[PDB]
């Protein structure tokens, strides 16, 4: 069962990030919600831990990831029979695709 948002004011919430230079974080005006922002091109791993400030007991999320950011080159090719070539490509999720 989920806790109601009105109980998260009792919780010690601790976010965890590997690369804060590519993806930044702030907490919002709701304790349950955080605002992320992309700063430069890359990929970042993210999780959150919640602790109880009476019992010191904690739980943690899965690790997740976020990328900060597809077309083909050339869009038109001209060859002769017996010709050989390679197709090149730009943007998308090059670390995940």
């Amino acid at each position: 069962q989920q806790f109601d948002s009105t109980q998260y004011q009792y919780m010690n919430i601790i976010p965890h990030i590997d690369n804060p230079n590519v993806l930044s974080m702030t907490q919002s005006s709701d304790s349950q919600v955080f605002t992320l922002k992309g700063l430069d091109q890359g990929l970042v791993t993210l999780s959150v831990t919640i602790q109880n400030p009476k019992t010191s007991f904690s739980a943690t999320s899965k690790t997740i990831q976020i990328q900060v950011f597809f077309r083909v080159s050339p869009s038109v090719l001209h060859l002769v029979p017996g010709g050989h070539f390679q197709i090149h490509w730009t943007g998308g999720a090059p670390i995940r695709q």
Binding site: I14, N19, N21, V22, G42, L43, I95, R96, Q97
Partner: protein
């Protein structure tokens, strides 16, 4: 990274999607540094006398 057999290395069984590693520049000024976990005492002052 590519996975082969130990007995057959002539052809890969599997290949990974490539991971990027982004190296950060240092500031070349030798500066005594600690890194501590949250809510934690440090013995540094005693250990360095």
């Amino acid at each position: 990274v590519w996975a082969y057999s130990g007995g057959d290395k002539t052809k890969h069984l599997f290949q990974a999607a490539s991971l990027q590693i982004n190296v950060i520049p240092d500031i070349p000024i030798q500066t005594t540094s600690l890194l501590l976990p949250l809510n934690t005492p440090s013995s540094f002052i005693v250990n360095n006398h």
